[PDB]
Amino acid sequence: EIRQNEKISYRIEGPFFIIHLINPDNLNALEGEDYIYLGELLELADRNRDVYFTIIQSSGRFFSSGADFKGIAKAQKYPSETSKWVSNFVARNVYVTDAFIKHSKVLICCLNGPAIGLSAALVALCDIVYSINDKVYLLYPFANLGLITEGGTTVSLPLKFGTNTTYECLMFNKPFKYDIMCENGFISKNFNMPSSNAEAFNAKVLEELREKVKGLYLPSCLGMKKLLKSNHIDAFNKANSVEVNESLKYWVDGEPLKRFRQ
Amino acid sequence: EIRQNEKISYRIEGPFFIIHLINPDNLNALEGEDYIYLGELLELADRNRDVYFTIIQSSGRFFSSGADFKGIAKAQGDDTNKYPSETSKWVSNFVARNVYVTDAFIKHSKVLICCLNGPAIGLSAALVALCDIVYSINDKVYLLYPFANLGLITEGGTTVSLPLKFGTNTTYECLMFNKPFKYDIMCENGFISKNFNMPSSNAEAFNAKVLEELREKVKGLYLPSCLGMKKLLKSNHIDAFNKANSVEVNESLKYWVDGEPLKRFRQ
Amino acid sequence: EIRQNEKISYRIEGPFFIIHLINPDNLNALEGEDYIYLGELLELADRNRDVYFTIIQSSGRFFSSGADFKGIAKAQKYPSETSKWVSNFVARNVYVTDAFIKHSKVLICCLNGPAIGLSAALVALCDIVYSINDKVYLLYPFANLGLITEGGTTVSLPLKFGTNTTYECLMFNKPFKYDIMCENGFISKNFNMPSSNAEAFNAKVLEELREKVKGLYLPSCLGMKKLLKSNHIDAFNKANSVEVNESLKYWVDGEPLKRFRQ
Amino acid sequence: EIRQNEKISYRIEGPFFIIHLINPDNLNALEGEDYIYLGELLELADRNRDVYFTIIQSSGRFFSSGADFKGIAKAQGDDTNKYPSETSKWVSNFVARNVYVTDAFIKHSKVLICCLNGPAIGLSAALVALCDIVYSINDKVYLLYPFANLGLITEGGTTVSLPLKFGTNTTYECLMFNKPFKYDIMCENGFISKNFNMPSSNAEAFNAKVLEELREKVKGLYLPSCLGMKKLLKSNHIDAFNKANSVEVNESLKYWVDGEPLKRFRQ
Amino acid sequence: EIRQNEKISYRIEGPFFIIHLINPDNLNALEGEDYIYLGELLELADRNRDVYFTIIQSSGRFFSSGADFKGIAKAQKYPSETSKWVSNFVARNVYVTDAFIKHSKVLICCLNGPAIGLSAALVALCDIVYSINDKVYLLYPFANLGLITEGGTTVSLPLKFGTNTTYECLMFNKPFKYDIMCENGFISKNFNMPSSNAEAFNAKVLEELREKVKGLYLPSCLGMKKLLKSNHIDAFNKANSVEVNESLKYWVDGEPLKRFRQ
Amino acid sequence: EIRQNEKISYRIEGPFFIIHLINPDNLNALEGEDYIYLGELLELADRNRDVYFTIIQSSGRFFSSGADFKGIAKAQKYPSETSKWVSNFVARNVYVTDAFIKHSKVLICCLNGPAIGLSAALVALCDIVYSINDKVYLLYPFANLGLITEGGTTVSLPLKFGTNTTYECLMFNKPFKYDIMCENGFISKNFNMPSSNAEAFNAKVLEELREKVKGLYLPSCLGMKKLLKSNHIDAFNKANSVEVNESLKYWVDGEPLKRFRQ
Ligand SMILES: CCCCCCCC(=O)SCCNC(=O)CCNC(=O)[C@H](O)C(C)(C)COP(=O)(O)OP(=O)(O)OC[C@H]1O[C@@H](n2cnc3c(N)ncnc32)[C@H](O)[C@@H]1OP(=O)(O)O
Ligand SMILES: CCCCCCCC(=O)SCCNC(=O)CCNC(=O)[C@H](O)C(C)(C)COP(=O)(O)OP(=O)(O)OC[C@H]1O[C@@H](n2cnc3c(N)ncnc32)[C@H](O)[C@@H]1OP(=O)(O)O
Ligand SMILES: CCCCCCCC(=O)SCCNC(=O)CCNC(=O)[C@H](O)C(C)(C)COP(=O)(O)OP(=O)(O)OC[C@H]1O[C@@H](n2cnc3c(N)ncnc32)[C@H](O)[C@@H]1OP(=O)(O)O
Ligand SMILES: CCCCCCCC(=O)SCCNC(=O)CCNC(=O)[C@H](O)C(C)(C)COP(=O)(O)OP(=O)(O)OC[C@H]1O[C@@H](n2cnc3c(N)ncnc32)[C@H](O)[C@@H]1OP(=O)(O)O
């Protein structure tokens, strides 16, 4: 049981809890409350004993263009700038990043197009990623926005792409392109479908997943994930706290607001 | 430069940045915005190159009775809505404040000294346990962490600080059964570095006397060494504190959302 | 549901799962299968959603004199000495130590008299310890038996008694006496009752516990323990594996067997 | 000095301690006592001051098909009892063997080289992933960890070794869906240091050719440097491996005791 | 302010602190005091608030052939062999490795040819590496010199090249060649220029860097690096201390000196 | 085999390797080369298979007053201040601290009077400490000398005395007195003998040790220590490297030299 959100839906099909970003006209840009909603859906999936896999799917040509700048401008009532940003940015980010970090079900991202910023951080926290075609990329534009690492990217990017690649991309605001994703095994399967039909891609992933789970003992999947998660859980939780608190001086100084308004 | 707050003041005297909780009629109970203010003051002290020591002092017979329950009830009565869910409300009201103020203490680079003029409770007691040095007014001080009785869990880094400073077995006895860490336990674990043995009716005299002794003790010291040493000492547990901060604040949410603390905060 | 064991019983009273060592004529010395049984009882308590506290109580004048030497002599069928000790010692020790380390309920030991060896290791893994009187002590006689640290004592003893004290006691086979236990806050309450009535002591602890839990929100107790456990869980699990494997060369060399037979 | 085992032999040639799995008709499937024997051989090599490299070689078209299911069925049919409970049985049969052999690999101080003459499966594949260097016979080798299909979880340190050597996302795809780590994935992650590109019908020629190249490569090296370097490299993940060993072996128990793997091991 | 060194110069251009190894006739082999000098330059760059990037460039056909053996022979006054090597090797290595490990500016290496030994260790500690052409390699000849890992290679090589590749190269004294560097993303861009003009390569890298920093908020770069560094800082500091002390027995035994003399 | 040193002797008696500081007229103040010598003696004891305990004893009324200031003034040939202090301070500290941290034999300190500075740091690295009488203290005067923590005190002091006590003593240059030592179990036994006869104290400790080892299986002592050491070995090695490098800016700035001259 949870409120409805017009930008994000979910459903359950057998052992699969499927979350769908459904706002393609705005490239599935997300506001603060939408990130919170996403975290609440993960927590709902996590409490359902019939769910073994949580699948995140999107719509249109982008997975998500990241945080909604119009919503950010609306957040610019509180005794100080610090208090405002603690409520609007710190809170949201620590909550949703935490929901991904601790999630006990196998978390699969269907990457139907590019992801940017905090949405791309969340993709990097998923356990398995499938791409629609070779035009997908991840962009973390923090240096261009006057921000720093978010959503656990301090840990996930070096871990999944290597340290030297991560510095080149983050320091100079360059994308992690399809080729770098394939070379680091970030994408487990490219479906090579046209960008004009995310829907067909999403259905095809689900169809393959129904085939792949046949005969598996699903509690083994969760048992294995529980052990695998313990390799970096501490580093992720440490990073979440420091990222969110260290970002405050950037917001309070004002640079991101200037730049979020080109 | 910072706004004023009627419940907390500060001043600078030489190398000392002094923070004073000044609401003794309410036992220096603090609302969310006051915890935030406290974190902002630490960050202000941390940026001031003339400050080597940040001293936290209070007033009256309590250091602080903890989070203000009236303010907590305000975050439940509406007051428009103005939140799409209970989760969203508690993320903004509890998660955010706690993660911010705990972090300000954990990372503080100046020597952080607590003048314990009476008991401390809850999140305020957690902050006392994050200070580097603690002086007590007399042997009637105690720390109480009443999480089990409020339907909550560890806050303000107590997951790490209590076992570290009081031992694990003592921590379980106190936290599981809502029992205070009393003066004798504090002294036996070296938590209190000096008991001034003054009457509880004059926090003001105690506070002045601590400052007077501190002015004497710093004479002849090379103060950048103090900071250099703290910078190394902090690295022993910094990772564990930062990890605990994130986890404590997120794991509390289900307790707030379930509603138990609100029932219990009501008497 | 579990088999019966004549040396160890259990019962449930409200939120308390009570385990009772009931072989005072043999000072509650335990064989390998009894340590395993103890681990199985912990795991049973851990799965019961009505249990919040697991209380371990004993009988007579000793809590437990440790591993039963007669049973050890019986273990002296297997292709090698290594294989024998892997089955008899390694297996038992890793299993029972693990059951204590991961236990999610609040674990309380009623110390009715001295504990020795592996039984004393288990006492040091409990969250809270109450003593009957000031004659209790813990002895870890590994240096005298030709063995090394067991039951997580590599971590628990320095953690609960300090490093320098631990070296003095372990290197020279000296007890951790009541005074050192009180000074390190290892014992949370001394009941100051006569050693001739463990039964009255055990009942009195339970009576105080029923009083102390009134008004508490018990899920908070478990929530707090779950966070507290994460401080050292990794070090305990690492120690368990190394202790058990490093002990093998001592058993295979034969020294403990000579000495276990004075 | 050690007993003989008809399924595994060893010999020493100069600085090389060579272990050979010699039961190709059964795809070098191993029973519990064989895993133990393998650990004993590692410990023997580790104590020999003339040995600098421990080389593991196999026979036939498979490196090893993993744990022998017939032997597993023996540990279920009785065979007197002779165990007070299912838990006690599995502690002795599974827990004990796994924790011992995994530990022998994790702590081994000599350079550990695997000659991969064909596929490896299960616990045997876990041991391959614990070796320092791996050479393949041809591009048809693969590693399979079929835990999800057997109703089990990670074994032999794979909790740590697979994400470390293949990356996290690749590891989840393979483990969650019971898919092999194929040659191409092995090459792309640098898991295989050299592919010899020889036919699968002659493991013997492959094994000899690896040894021949190794005799050439060690010429002129100061061999104590190899060991000194390994001693430092091992410290990067030694704690994580030891922690994982204990947890893997204990967490598997509920899967054995519940019975699922026995049903599934039966076809 | 710092003394001059004829083998290494530096200059500052805008946000770039540029260090130039300028002894191509000796393949930029470095003596102990030159490594120390290099550490001092990093520490100077680190204290300059206008510097955001520290760029290390070399000359000729080699980046650096490593420690100068003629200088080593000079070091073979002190009460013991141990005391001599503590002063000559331990001290310098622990200092320069530490300067690279803690450096807070973005550290970029312009790899104009091969690097060997301690110089190659320093290349592996840089955040970003650009290569002149596909003939560059790194060689860590410790096994052939009778030494062990240096300059944090205990951590940096498995981290950046993987553990199995690291064992093959280190155990058998084999280079990490261009192909292995590209496959692990160690090199972020190959400029594909001729080895006869390091100068042109160096100028071209600086030109591209000036282009890539345009529009970026440079304090974000440093903020991000400060978080990224925390992933492995503890392991690097631990390794530094252990590498330098464990190498002593190799120097004192004398093997490296015999071998440094062929 | 090792050279002789007039300020420090050693001998072997059965399983005991006994190191004796023998310069009471100068309160056993030690120069750099004497610290190095002390490290070499530990490494000699560590390589001797008949040694199970390494015992450090001193003479006169002080254990050691710390680093010899006259020797420090001599050290104030080198291209820079940095290079000088790297050779004189960094090198020696990193070497001797490492020798104590890694030592595999049981390390016992006979505290015949106060210890100061780096010598007191070494006392805090010993496994077991016995005091002559209740007038012993440890003083770490770093704040008064314009230095920072040394000899692993960053880790050993909070570990053995607690964090709040450590801040009070270090920040304000106050001694850890006998009472604080006894309350934290730092001292395992006070012999309560007069300060005018260190020799009798030293002989009495050895006599009690010969009595306490009787019947023990000494390889168990070492086996246990090897496991106990792993609890904090990484933190000690990390601290060693950081302490020695971070102290440099204090020496180079000059403050300690001014203050070492009163
Ligand atoms: C509390 C949470 C804290 C948040 C942490 C902050 C960090 C982040 O999440 S990063 C978000 C920063 N966003 C960016 O940097 C913008 C980059 N995204 C882009 O899409 C690029 O502009 C670009 C060039 C790739 C898009 O090209 P293009 O496909 O032409 O986009 P466009 O056609 O304009 O998109 C369609 C519509 O979606 C809207 N839209 C797209 N992205 C966003 C966004 N991030 N925010 C708001 N609206 C957006 C457009 O305004 C446009 O509206 P309309 O149809 O009315 O013109
Ligand atoms: C964003 C932040 C999230 C943090 C979440 C939770 C963390 C916490 O801080 S937990 C702390 C919650 N507080 C408590 O459990 C205890 C608070 N209440 C108490 O009064 C003291 O504990 C107690 C009982 C020891 C005081 O004893 P006593 O000396 O008798 O004082 P008492 O007479 O009760 O109070 C004196 C006056 O101060 C007021 N006051 C004292 N503490 C508080 C408080 N915490 N909130 C509101 N008012 C308070 C009283 O209401 C009373 O006012 P009035 O004169 O109008 O009656
Ligand atoms: C698979 C698991 C691996 C096990 C890990 C191994 C490490 C350990 O657990 S340590 C166990 C080692 N045990 C010891 O060192 C023995 C020390 N225990 C003692 O009780 C001491 O002998 C001592 C002096 C304190 C007891 O004094 P006391 O009270 O006079 O004992 P006592 O009167 O003989 O005890 C009563 C009976 O219990 C029996 N008993 C007591 N302890 C044990 C024991 N550990 N094993 C077997 N039987 C025992 C006695 O044989 C005696 O039998 P009876 O009544 O027929 O004479
Ligand atoms: C204490 C230890 C605890 C460890 C617990 C679990 C960890 C594990 O090791 S899991 C591994 C379990 N094994 C498996 O899942 C796969 C084993 N079975 C297989 O045959 C191979 O995987 C497979 C299917 C790829 C082989 O393909 P293929 O080339 O067709 O060989 P196949 O014809 O099946 O077998 C050849 C012969 O060797 C025998 N054999 C092969 N592997 C095994 C085995 N693991 N156990 C018993 N017999 C085996 C076959 O029974 C067959 O004998 P026969 O001539 O009498 O029919």
Side-chain angles (χ1 to χ4, degrees), chain A residues 122-178:
Chain A
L122 300 181
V123 174
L125 296 178
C126 292
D127 302 315
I128 297 172
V129 181
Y130 300 126
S131 57
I132 186 162
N133 57 49
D134 64 11
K135 292 182 271 147
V136 300
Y137 65 85
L138 306 172
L139 179 70
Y140 302 93
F142 307 131
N144 209 32
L145 300 172
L147 293 170
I148 57 176
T149 38
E150 299 179 12
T153 46
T154 303
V155 176
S156 65
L157 299 182
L159 178 71
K160 297 190 183 190
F161 297 104
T163 318
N164 288 22
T165 299
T166 292
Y167 274 92
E168 180 68 22
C169 295
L170 291 185
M171 297 303 108
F172 299 123
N173 181 23
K174 292 166 63 177
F176 294 75
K177 294 181 155 167
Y178 177 79

Side-chain angles (χ1 to χ4, degrees), chain B residues 25-27 29 32 35 62 65-70 72 93-94 97-98 121-124 142 146-147 150 152 155 256 265:
Chain B
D25 298 341
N26 199 22
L27 305 183
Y35 283 114
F62 268 60
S65 62
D68 190 323
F69 63 74
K70 271 147 268 153
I72 292 291
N93 290 118
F94 173 87
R97 276 76 173 260
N98 277 38
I121 301 193
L123 181 59
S124 299
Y142 63 85
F147 308 131
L150 300 172
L152 293 171
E155 298 179 12
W256 289 104
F265 249 115

Side-chain angles (χ1 to χ4, degrees), chain F residues 224-235:
Chain F
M224 287 186 285
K225 169 157 187 183
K226 184 172 179 165
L227 301 188
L228 295 157
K229 179 187 292 304
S230 74
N231 289 326
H232 296 112
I233 187 67
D234 287 355

Side-chain angles (χ1 to χ4, degrees), chain F residues 71-87:
Chain F
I72 293 180
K74 316 299 264 165
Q76 258 276 197
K77 197 140 154 43
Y78 293 112
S80 58
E81 275 306 289
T82 294
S83 179
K84 179 163 71 206
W85 294 116
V86 166
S87 260

Side-chain angles (χ1 to χ4, degrees), chain B residues 102-136:
Chain B
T102 304
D103 175 83
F105 279 72
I106 287 161
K107 78 189 174 190
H108 196 69
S109 67
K110 314 301 163 87
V111 182
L112 195 54
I113 299 181
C114 175
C115 296
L116 196 65
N117 59 305
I121 301 193
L123 181 59
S124 299
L127 301 182
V128 174
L130 296 179
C131 294
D132 301 316
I133 297 171
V134 181
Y135 300 125
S136 57

Side-chain angles (χ1 to χ4, degrees), chain B residues 148-149 151-152 159 169 173 264, chain C residues 130 160 212 215 217 220 231:
Chain B
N149 210 31
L152 293 171
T159 304
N169 287 19
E173 178 67 23
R264 295 170 170 259
Chain C
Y130 300 126
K160 297 190 183 190
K212 299 199 301 199
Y217 190 62
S220 286
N231 290 325

Side-chain angles (χ1 to χ4, degrees), chain D residues 194-259:
Chain D
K194 174 166 170 176
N195 182 39
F196 279 69
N197 190 31
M198 288 171 72
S200 301
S201 54
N202 204 352
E204 211 178 333
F206 162 64
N207 289 335
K209 186 81 199 166
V210 173
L211 292 173
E212 180 186 320
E213 295 195 9
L214 291 172
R215 289 197 294 275
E216 248 326 294
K217 298 200 301 197
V218 300
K219 280 177 178 163
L221 301 185
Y222 190 60
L223 296 184
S225 285
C226 300
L227 301 194
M229 286 188 284
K230 168 157 188 184
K231 183 172 178 165
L232 300 187
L233 295 157
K234 179 187 293 303
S235 75
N236 290 328
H237 295 114
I238 187 67
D239 288 354
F241 277 112
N242 284 322
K243 160 204 117 277
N245 192 15
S246 197
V247 172
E248 284 172 350
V249 110
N250 283 287
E251 291 318 285
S252 285
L253 265 169
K254 73 180 83 60
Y255 293 83
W256 289 104
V257 168
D258 157 280

Side-chain angles (χ1 to χ4, degrees), chain D residues 81-262:
Chain D
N81 228 41
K82 34 100 165 41
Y83 292 112
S85 58
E86 276 306 289
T87 294
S88 179
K89 180 163 71 205
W90 295 114
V91 167
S92 261
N93 290 118
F94 173 87
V95 166
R97 276 76 173 260
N98 277 38
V99 85
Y100 172 74
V101 73
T102 304
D103 175 83
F105 279 72
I106 287 161
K107 78 189 174 190
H108 196 69
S109 67
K110 314 301 163 87
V111 182
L112 195 54
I113 299 181
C114 175
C115 296
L116 196 65
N117 59 305
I121 301 193
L123 181 59
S124 299
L127 301 182
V128 174
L130 296 179
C131 294
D132 301 316
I133 297 171
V134 181
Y135 300 125
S136 57
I137 186 162
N138 56 50
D139 64 12
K140 293 182 271 146
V141 299
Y142 63 85
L143 305 173
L144 180 70
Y145 302 93
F147 308 131
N149 210 31
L150 300 172
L152 293 171
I153 59 175
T154 39
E155 298 179 12
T158 46
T159 304
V160 176
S161 66
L162 300 181
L164 177 70
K165 297 191 183 189
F166 297 104
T168 318
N169 287 19
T170 297
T171 293
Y172 272 91
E173 178 67 23
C174 296
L175 292 186
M176 297 305 109
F177 300 122
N178 181 23
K179 292 166 64 177
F181 294 76
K182 293 181 155 167
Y183 178 77
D184 280 343
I185 289 291
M186 292 187 263
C187 277
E188 277 143 30
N189 285 281
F191 184 84
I192 287 165
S193 291
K194 174 166 170 176
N195 182 39
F196 279 69
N197 190 31
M198 288 171 72
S200 301
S201 54
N202 204 352
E204 211 178 333
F206 162 64
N207 289 335
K209 186 81 199 166
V210 173
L211 292 173
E212 180 186 320
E213 295 195 9
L214 291 172
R215 289 197 294 275
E216 248 326 294
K217 298 200 301 197
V218 300
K219 280 177 178 163
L221 301 185
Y222 190 60
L223 296 184
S225 285
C226 300
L227 301 194
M229 286 188 284
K230 168 157 188 184
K231 183 172 178 165
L232 300 187
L233 295 157
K234 179 187 293 303
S235 75
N236 290 328
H237 295 114
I238 187 67
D239 288 354
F241 277 112
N242 284 322
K243 160 204 117 277
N245 192 15
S246 197
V247 172
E248 284 172 350
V249 110
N250 283 287
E251 291 318 285
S252 285
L253 265 169
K254 73 180 83 60
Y255 293 83
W256 289 104
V257 168
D258 157 280
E260 186 74 18
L262 296 154

